[PDB]
Amino acid sequence: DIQMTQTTSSLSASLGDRVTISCRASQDISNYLNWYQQKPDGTVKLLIFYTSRLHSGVPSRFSGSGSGTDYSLTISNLEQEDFATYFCQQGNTLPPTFGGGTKLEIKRADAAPTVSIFPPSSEQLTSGGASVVCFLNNFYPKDINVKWKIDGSERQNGVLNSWTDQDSKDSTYSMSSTLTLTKDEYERHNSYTCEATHKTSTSPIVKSFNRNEC
Amino acid sequence: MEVRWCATSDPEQHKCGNMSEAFREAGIQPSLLCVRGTSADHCVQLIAAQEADAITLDGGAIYEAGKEHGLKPVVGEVYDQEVGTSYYAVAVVRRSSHVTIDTLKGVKSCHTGINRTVGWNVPVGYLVESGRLSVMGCDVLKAVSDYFGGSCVPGAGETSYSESLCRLCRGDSSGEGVCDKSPLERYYDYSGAFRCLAEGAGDVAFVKHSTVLENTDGKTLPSWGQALLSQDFELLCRDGSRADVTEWRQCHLARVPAHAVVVRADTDGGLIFRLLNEGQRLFSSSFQMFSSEAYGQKDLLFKDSTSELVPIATQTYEAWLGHEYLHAMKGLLCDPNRLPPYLRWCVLSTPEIQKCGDMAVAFRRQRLKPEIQCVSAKSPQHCMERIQAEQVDAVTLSGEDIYTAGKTYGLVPAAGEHYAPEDSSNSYYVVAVVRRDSSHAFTLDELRGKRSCHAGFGSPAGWDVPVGALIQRGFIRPKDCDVLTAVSEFFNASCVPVNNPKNYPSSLCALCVGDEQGRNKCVGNSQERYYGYRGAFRCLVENAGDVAFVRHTTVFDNTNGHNSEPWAAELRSEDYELLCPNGARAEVSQFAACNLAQIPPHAVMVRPDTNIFTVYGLLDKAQDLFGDDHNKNGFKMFDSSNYHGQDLLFKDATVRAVPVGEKTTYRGWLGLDYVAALEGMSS
Amino acid sequence: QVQLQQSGAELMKPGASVKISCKATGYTFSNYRIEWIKQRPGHGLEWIGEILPRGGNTNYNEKFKGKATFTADTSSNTAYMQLTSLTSEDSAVYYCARDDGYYGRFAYWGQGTLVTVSAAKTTPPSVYPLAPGSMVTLGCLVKGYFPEPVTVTWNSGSLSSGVHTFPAVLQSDLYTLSSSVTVPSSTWPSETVTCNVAHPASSTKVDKKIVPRDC
Ligand SMILES: *[C@@H]1O[C@H](CO)[C@@H](O[C@@H]2O[C@H](CO)[C@@H](O)[C@H](O)[C@H]2NC(C)=O)[C@H](O)[C@H]1NC(C)=O
Ligand SMILES: *[C@@H]1O[C@H](CO)[C@@H](O[C@@H]2O[C@H](CO)[C@@H](O)[C@H](O)[C@H]2NC(C)=O)[C@H](O)[C@H]1NC(C)=O
Ligand SMILES: *[C@@H]1O[C@H](CO)[C@@H](O)[C@H](O)[C@H]1NC(C)=O
Ligand SMILES: [Fe+3]
Ligand SMILES: [Mg+2]
Ligand code: NA
């Protein structure tokens, strides 16, 4: 097989920019390279075929280039609908092989998370369970860490994170990290904390609660 | 039995006299005497007159000595262990000139001698085929005198065209014996012809491959007050480029037989070889037989190139000279008094009768021999029967009729029609066009199971050639001459439109689409959308088939804006490729190098005995006056406006009539790719 | 226009087999090869194989061979793919695409078909309120449901801005999700905030009012 490698899996840019996504084949593919665009709803469009030819209907901002094993796709005067994932494919030899994708993300000013911690509801406790949810809302860039502390001591077993994709209005990210335990482990401890570390946070952001307090 | 060798000059006699005494001192038997002659041709008469016994001669001289005087070549020369008893002819010019092979008109030339191998027979014999010199009515002397601006041709003294053929000749201290076939004429033989070039008198010289190294690099004869260098000269190649003197193994005009000792048929043969090998064997020491610089000249008795003299098995001029040599001899050489007075053309209609009648008048008024006569025949096939029956002499035939004429009646092409470079309705290339897909690429040999778009049943390019080709190549192997079922079992699905079908396979109509409303599917006319070459090409672009067999022009006429039908409106030619019989793929623009076969232009078929050079010579001289459709000479050979017909005698599309060159046979004219497919279909 | 419409999301047990369809419209079905591609998160796109509907010629990717099988009914303009011996590694989004016949380019793609391989049994979610102890952020915890999806609304869609519903994560064989809403401090304790979670797969909806914790 011919392996297509795409340099970067994620790239950030703002409207009007010139962006270049790049592909690289395991062997000389003699310009038989196609470029596709996939939107978040799983809709796939063909943009360029055979290195540089535009598919009919494709805006001229998209342009293709390359030769040998190195190819690249360029988007001039970036527009709103261009923020999507871009794949490459070779038509040189079967089986056709694709790249891993490159997601174009909207650039924006760095913002800090709005951390909120919630103890288990009485309903879950009376059901024999206990989940402590901590929200980390509207931050940028996507990179962040969460540290769960129980009475000062670290914790990692019951934790599970979930990240959103860029918000439609804010262009920010959010994450939820919940720590699920038995009812009895929760009732054996007092203070609970979630710590958020971000680019903005030269020092972590801590939200905690006492099990004995309302 | 004393052997009286003949000498052609005083230094040749002195060498022979010194060799005789060197022989007897070593007790060589028999004796050797040296009779002196005025020329090489004079000496052959001395041999005929029993006044002399032996002489070494050039091929063209061995020819005439063996014919008009009947002497036999007994011993021959071996120049190199490489070239053996043969040598290569060349045409040489200075570095300070742009004269390539095909640019010799009005060029000053130097020749070794008339009716001589390297300076006349080979250069002129080649020029009639692949240099384009036409000879009309067997007058070779007129042809060469008009072609070259001026020439030095020793031996052409009492000829009609003496002025032109002896213009560059000088010779002798006093300037006497000019243009004589003697070493007297300073520009005679290889040595003199090359000297003619280097002394500025001439611009080209037809000499041996080795004569440039033999007269340069300090080997230049002292008498020529100069010291010529080998890198001041160049050969001319048959391709059309000027190579260097060293690469004569690639750059030569012909491989010709070696010179030989000719004696009378009456005279013993083994006696002459024993005497010479006795000396040659013992002297390789007391006497250098093949060198001759000690006498102030080149090539005395034997050419300096000679390394060894060998016995000859068959002592006849026909066997010694190559069979190829004698064939070129009987064509180029024709008696300008014993040629058929008339050339009888074959006509198949009353308008053809009238055009031919007018053609005979126009030709005769312009004094062009032979005279044309018109004989009517009811069919093109019936013409062939009459031509071979020696009732008719010539006719112009189509590709299919050329095959039947040469294979069944033994006819040969004498001249061919040549169409305009932009015209491609008559002689075109059959190609296999495919979509540009690398991941799904295939070769002309991996066509089994594919979908095929043919133009129509019996279409030359779309059916006859491709199916014929796959049968001969051994991919379609039919049973009981059932070709329809063989192709319908080879391709998974095809579109082969047909009219009046009876047991047509379903597969052969599978891809056809018919009317805009789907009616008339697979019908043999424009009602079927995939009918014809553009339909077959459409069948391909619409992904209905995988390969389309069409003409080289089909893709250009249906892509790049040249067709605004919606299916072809946005097509680009770069999205298509051609499959070659050799296995390669090529861009649509390389059809000349990547085609299945070329549909041959028409050609004039005559009998083998008929001198084809008089036929092309007549047509070329005629077309010089009557070829161009707007000539002011009162006849148009390639137009039929004056008659109630079209394509009379020749297709009106003919621009020029051309020589057959080396396609002297029906198979060679039709091409091998084309005959393979035709023969493939016959079974 | 050319359009390939694929079958709906399928949910199979491991070991079972599935048959995805892809009905083609707007062109001659018989002529163009139909490609089949697999998409999994963090695994790019994988070509399973192709079928030319005229004659049924197939080319399968070796890594799939055995698993995938293609057919095409030229009378109904529909191409099929069957996957056998299903496993969680087969849980992916499967597209049919069309080969233009030139440069191996796929100009027209299907919408995709979600295939999910799970031994889990249909289970409705357990919804818990997340209340706290400026702007105020509230939440909803949706635990232990199978299959996806659940739709989370706040006040039956009335509260639309300031909501963050997170992607579900497999707790074991059941899914779990959370959703946050942030409203002006004025509005929550005063005026009601409810969390609506719908699970069509189990025909269950539950509304959960976010009340402040009792002291
Ligand atoms: C050997 O060669 C020499 C050189 O040519 C011959 O010498 C000439 O002889 C003729 C009479 O035979 C004279 O007219 C010339 O004056 C001589 N020339 C020179 C340069 O000497 C010689 O005759 C030859 N020998 C034999 C046996 O024939
Ligand atoms: C030519 O036609 C045959 C029969 O229609 C095609 O055969 C199919 O081939 C695939 C594999 O390529 C098999 O899995 C099917 O079982 C075959 N079907 C039948 C009905 O035999 C064949 O592929 C076609 N060849 C080409 C080159 O397209
Ligand atoms: C060449 O050969 C022919 C043979 O018939 C002869 O008649 C002719 O005169 C020769 N040419 C010359 C100029 O000797
Ligand atoms: Fe010679
Ligand atoms: Mg039969
Ligand atoms: Na004409």
mmCIF file of N, CA and C and ligand atoms in Angstrom, chain B residues 57-61 77 79 87 112 116-119 189-190 208 256-259 303 325, ligand 4:
data_model
loop_
_atom_site.group_PDB
_atom_site.id
_atom_site.type_symbol
_atom_site.label_atom_id
_atom_site.label_comp_id
_atom_site.label_asym_id
_atom_site.label_seq_id
_atom_site.Cartn_x
_atom_site.Cartn_y
_atom_site.Cartn_z
ATOM 1 N N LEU B 57 39.821 -4.539 -60.367
ATOM 2 C CA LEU B 57 38.784 -3.584 -60.729
ATOM 3 C C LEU B 57 37.785 -3.295 -59.640
ATOM 4 N N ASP B 58 37.129 -2.146 -59.745
ATOM 5 C CA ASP B 58 36.056 -1.745 -58.857
ATOM 6 C C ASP B 58 34.781 -2.522 -59.235
ATOM 7 N N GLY B 59 33.843 -2.661 -58.304
ATOM 8 C CA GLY B 59 32.567 -3.329 -58.565
ATOM 9 C C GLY B 59 31.851 -2.937 -59.850
ATOM 10 N N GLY B 60 31.595 -1.651 -60.046
ATOM 11 C CA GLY B 60 30.967 -1.168 -61.270
ATOM 12 C C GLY B 60 31.771 -1.488 -62.515
ATOM 13 N N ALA B 61 33.103 -1.575 -62.384
ATOM 14 C CA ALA B 61 34.000 -1.934 -63.484
ATOM 15 C C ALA B 61 34.001 -3.444 -63.708
ATOM 16 N N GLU B 77 39.793 -8.612 -52.774
ATOM 17 C CA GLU B 77 40.524 -7.947 -51.707
ATOM 18 C C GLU B 77 39.812 -8.023 -50.370
ATOM 19 N N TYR B 79 39.848 -5.866 -47.042
ATOM 20 C CA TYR B 79 40.343 -4.624 -46.461
ATOM 21 C C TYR B 79 40.642 -4.752 -44.965
ATOM 22 N N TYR B 87 33.171 -3.030 -48.344
ATOM 23 C CA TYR B 87 33.442 -1.704 -47.823
ATOM 24 C C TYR B 87 32.171 -0.868 -47.855
ATOM 25 N N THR B 112 34.178 9.534 -58.073
ATOM 26 C CA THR B 112 35.344 8.722 -58.398
ATOM 27 C C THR B 112 35.380 8.405 -59.893
ATOM 28 N N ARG B 116 30.773 3.529 -61.628
ATOM 29 C CA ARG B 116 31.708 3.102 -60.595
ATOM 30 C C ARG B 116 30.970 3.037 -59.257
ATOM 31 N N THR B 117 31.297 2.047 -58.432
ATOM 32 C CA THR B 117 30.596 1.705 -57.202
ATOM 33 C C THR B 117 30.296 2.863 -56.220
ATOM 34 N N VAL B 118 31.304 3.469 -55.613
ATOM 35 C CA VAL B 118 31.118 4.436 -54.547
ATOM 36 C C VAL B 118 30.912 5.857 -55.021
ATOM 37 N N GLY B 119 31.415 6.187 -56.201
ATOM 38 C CA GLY B 119 31.302 7.543 -56.699
ATOM 39 C C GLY B 119 30.146 7.754 -57.631
ATOM 40 N N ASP B 189 39.311 8.588 -59.196
ATOM 41 C CA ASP B 189 39.344 7.573 -58.146
ATOM 42 C C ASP B 189 39.109 8.171 -56.747
ATOM 43 N N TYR B 190 39.100 7.347 -55.669
ATOM 44 C CA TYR B 190 38.843 7.845 -54.317
ATOM 45 C C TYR B 190 39.715 9.041 -53.963
ATOM 46 N N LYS B 208 34.991 6.138 -50.358
ATOM 47 C CA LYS B 208 34.950 5.052 -49.402
ATOM 48 C C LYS B 208 34.921 5.617 -47.963
ATOM 49 N N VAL B 256 29.035 -2.368 -49.825
ATOM 50 C CA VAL B 256 29.276 -2.754 -51.205
ATOM 51 C C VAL B 256 30.346 -3.809 -51.291
ATOM 52 N N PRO B 257 30.319 -4.710 -52.298
ATOM 53 C CA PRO B 257 31.381 -5.726 -52.391
ATOM 54 C C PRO B 257 32.757 -5.144 -52.709
ATOM 55 N N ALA B 258 33.799 -5.900 -52.376
ATOM 56 C CA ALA B 258 35.194 -5.514 -52.594
ATOM 57 C C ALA B 258 35.618 -5.557 -54.080
ATOM 58 N N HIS B 259 36.756 -4.939 -54.412
ATOM 59 C CA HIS B 259 37.312 -4.990 -55.743
ATOM 60 C C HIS B 259 37.884 -6.397 -56.005
ATOM 61 N N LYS B 303 44.373 -1.539 -53.982
ATOM 62 C CA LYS B 303 44.079 -0.423 -53.093
ATOM 63 C C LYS B 303 44.869 -0.588 -51.779
ATOM 64 N N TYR B 325 23.124 -5.585 -55.209
ATOM 65 C CA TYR B 325 23.891 -4.772 -56.150
ATOM 66 C C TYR B 325 23.313 -4.889 -57.562
HETATM 67 FE FE FE D 4 35.498 0.951 -55.617
#
